């Protein structure tokens, strides 16, 4: 009943996507209608523009705050942490669910003013759903599932979530795999793929309701490099900004006082810049989130068009011709693009900071695309005829590449490129874009940590494995430091009354079996229930017939923490005994490991 489980989650996710998306569409449409209709006067119009983005965000913030600390503001990093082995029980709990979806919806509605995507939150939701499903299974049939299985399920859920938001089965899962953990099995991948497929099928069902040259390649590479550089710049800012936010007593105090209020303020600020007559002509502000991307990836070469004919500024953004928003007479299209970039960067970090359920991939992708588009435009201007069979330069492709590359750099993921391709439809120029992406990754992974990684660092979540730009003394600690030094030895030489007493007292899941009280040397392990049963009906007991489970593995006190962690992850274990010169000294489990990790993180 694994396949069935996989199926069930996926369909649900798809349904959620459909509903939420629909809601977003409707509300946004309504807002648009209101904006046009309210009137010519600036005050009223301003209010309309500002209130809607503010209010929704505030509501979302409110929803986030009241439930539990890890309820809102976390998507991928927490998931990653969980995968790494250190589990946060508050994260997977479903009491969260009801608060978060609504918040996400609100965020989406708020749209291109707030400028936030839906991925991470969606992924989190999916994971939660998966967990819930698992729990039921555990309850309804058999016993409580092994940790490994649960982890796998979570991973699958995450993959499905990532696919769903995209509307892309092949790439999304891959992306999830890349980001979400360090190593990954093939079965997991397969499961993810299956989930994605299911989601796609559901979506389909729910439709009734509703040849580049070497110079070009070189250019693409350059573009990719540029994107990577930009990505790197962004990441540092993002991390530093987050740190600052965490620190500042004034800021921190304010946050403590009113989570909603700060968010509201941020929204207001965003609106003030993002107002259409004030600075929206320059930023191409008045576009939906999807619309922006479409505009960026439009087949027409803008500069040339502009030169040919001065384009009109329509009353509402033209469904066929979205690029008209990017033009201004005083600021050439290039200028507008530049404004969008820098201004977006300034805003984007701020947006990321605000405490709410929100994804930060889509915005990054858009940013990447914008730069690419700009580059393409520049190239076009340089070579109006084009590069010499004299083919014209298509900036759409460039834009796409930029989107792929910058985003990849940010996230440390080549499967961004794949996703881009999928979105496009055409794999005809698979290479140059891919190359660019790779270049970006190289530049960015060598200078900065991933966006997700950065966020994790800022949080100070218990993630043992190495991250760039994060000094920590993890190699120094050994098992002797963090082992559970208190244990309950049961030796073959001991009396029966004593054993009984011990049983009455502790009821530990697995007692060690020892040779003798003096030596304290392990010869196996005993389960507790079985022992109890035996008592109801130690050498003598053994003779009579209680089953001994042999100790399959033994850690030393002088072993490193890292190694232990790896063992726990990879072999998929629950608990393990420690032995110094053969003696039962410690009992290592996840509880202790987790504690150690926490200590390492937070001195």
């Amino acid at each position, epitope marked *: 009943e694994d396949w069935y489980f996989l199926t069930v989650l996926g369909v649900l996710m798809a349904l959620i996507s459909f509903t939420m998306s629909f809601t977003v569409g409707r509300v946004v449409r309504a807002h648009k209608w209101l904006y046009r209709e309210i009137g010519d006067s600036h005050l009223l119009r301003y209010l309309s523009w500002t209130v809607y983005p503010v209010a929704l965000v505030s509501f979302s913030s409110g929803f986030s705050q009241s439930i539990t600390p890890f309820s809102g503001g976390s998507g991928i990093p927490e998931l990653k942490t969980i995968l790494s082995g250190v589990v946060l029980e508050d994260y997977l709990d479903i009491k969260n669910f009801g608060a978060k979806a609504v918040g996400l919806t609100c965020t989406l509605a708020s749209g291109s003013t707030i400028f936030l995507g839906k991925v991470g939150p969606f992924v989190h939701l999916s994971v939660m759903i998966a967990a819930y499903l698992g729990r039921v299974r555990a309850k309804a049939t058999g016993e409580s599932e092994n940790k490994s299985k649960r982890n796998e399920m979570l991973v699958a859920g995450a993959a499905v979530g990532v696919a769903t938001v995209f509307a892309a089965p092949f790439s999304g899962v891959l992306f999830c795999i890349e980001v979400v953990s360090s190593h990954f099995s093939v079965w997991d991948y397969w499961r993810g793929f299956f989930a994605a497929t299911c989601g796609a099928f559901m979506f389909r069902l729910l439709a009734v309701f509703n040849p580049f040259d070497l110079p070009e390649i070189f250019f693409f590479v350059a573009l990719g490099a540029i994107c990577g550089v930009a990505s790197c710049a962004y990441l540092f800012c993002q991390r530093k900004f987050l740190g600052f936010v965490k620190t500042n007593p004034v800021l921190s105090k304010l946050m403590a006082t009113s989570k909603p209020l700060y968010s509201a303020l941020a929204a207001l600020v965003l609106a003030s810049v993002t107002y259409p007559p004030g600075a929206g002509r320059f930023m191409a502000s008045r576009l939906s989130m999807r619309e922006y991307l479409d505009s960026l990836l439009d*087949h*027409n*070469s803008w500069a*040339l*068009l*502009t*030169r*040919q*004919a*001065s*384009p*009109p500024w329509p009353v509402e953004p033209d469904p*066929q*011709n979205l690029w008209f928003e990017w033009y201004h007479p005083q600021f*050439t299209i290039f200028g507008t693009l530049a404004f969008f970039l820098v201004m977006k960067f300034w805003m984007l970090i701020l947006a990321t900071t605000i405490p709410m359920p929100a994804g930060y991939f889509m915005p990054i992708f858009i940013f990447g695309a914008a730069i690419g588009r700009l580059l393409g435009e520049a190239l076009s201007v340089a070579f*109006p*005829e084009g590069i010499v069979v004299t083919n*014209p330069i298509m900036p759409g492709g460039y834009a796409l590449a930029g989107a792929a590359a910058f985003s990849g750099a940010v996230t440390h993921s080549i499967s961004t490129a794949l996703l881009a391709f999928e979105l496009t439809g055409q794999i005809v120029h698979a290479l140059p874009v891919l190359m660019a992406v790779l270049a970006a990754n190289a530049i960015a992974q060598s200078c900065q940590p991933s966006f997700y990684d950065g966020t994790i660092i800022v949080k100070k979540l218990p993630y043992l494995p190495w991250i760039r730009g994060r000094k920590i003394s993890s190699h120094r600690v050994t098992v002797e430091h963090f082992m559970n030094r208190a244990i309950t030895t049961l030796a073959k030489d001991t009396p029966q009354e004593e054993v009984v007493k011990v049983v009455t007292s502790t009821d530990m899941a697995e007692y060690p079996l020892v040779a003798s009280t003096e030596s304290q040397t392990l010869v196996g392990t005993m389960r507790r229930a079985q022992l109890v049963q035996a008592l109801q009906a130690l050498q003598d007991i053994l003779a009579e017939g209680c089953p001994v489970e042999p100790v399959t593995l033994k850690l030393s006190p002088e072993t490193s923490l890292h190694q232990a962690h790896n063992l726990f992850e990879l072999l998929n274990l629950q608990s393990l005994f420690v032995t110094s010169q053969g003696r039962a000294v410690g009992f290592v489990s996840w509880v202790e490991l987790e504690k150690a990790i926490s200590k390492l993180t937070n001195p």
Partner: antibody
Amino acid sequence: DVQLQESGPGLVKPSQSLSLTCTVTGDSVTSDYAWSWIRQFPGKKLEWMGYITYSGNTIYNPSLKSRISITRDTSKNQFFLQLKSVIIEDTATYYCSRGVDYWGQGTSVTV
Amino acid sequence: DIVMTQSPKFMSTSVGDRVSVTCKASQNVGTNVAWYQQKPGQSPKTLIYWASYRYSGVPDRFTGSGSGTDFTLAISNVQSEDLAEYFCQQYNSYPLTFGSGTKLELK
């Protein structure tokens, strides 16, 4: 209100290079637009010649790359053609235009 | 070069009727098509710079539609002053190609 006024010789002999001077009033030639040249034959079929950018990068029709040469003087705000190797088939009414927005009145060229 | 074919080459309608001149492009143009009006003798004044966008000072009756490969100039309520040739041109690619246009007479 951008206004373009052509001027030059009407009658020309074949195998002798012709030149048309288009003066501009309203906008500067140094602005970022497509300052194109176009001609219409006696049978009323239009052919696009080419244009100069703000910087000076000339772009021509592939079919007429050999013979066409287009230049400007930024002081006077004007456009100069220098169409060489003139043939009786080239006989047409010429049109000096700023992109697509505004077209000049034009002059009738005769070979 | 990208050829602009168009039809119908000649038309004859009364005052008040509708006329629809259609242009067809070989390759994909997008929406980057401009329509003109040339009265015999005078310069060809632009009417519609992008399909579904009239130039300032032009009557509302001159409507333009289409995208991709096929485009249509529709004129409703024809007056006596609309005796003219009407060309479509594209400017997505280079070189810029004009259709031969259509001479229009009235009864």
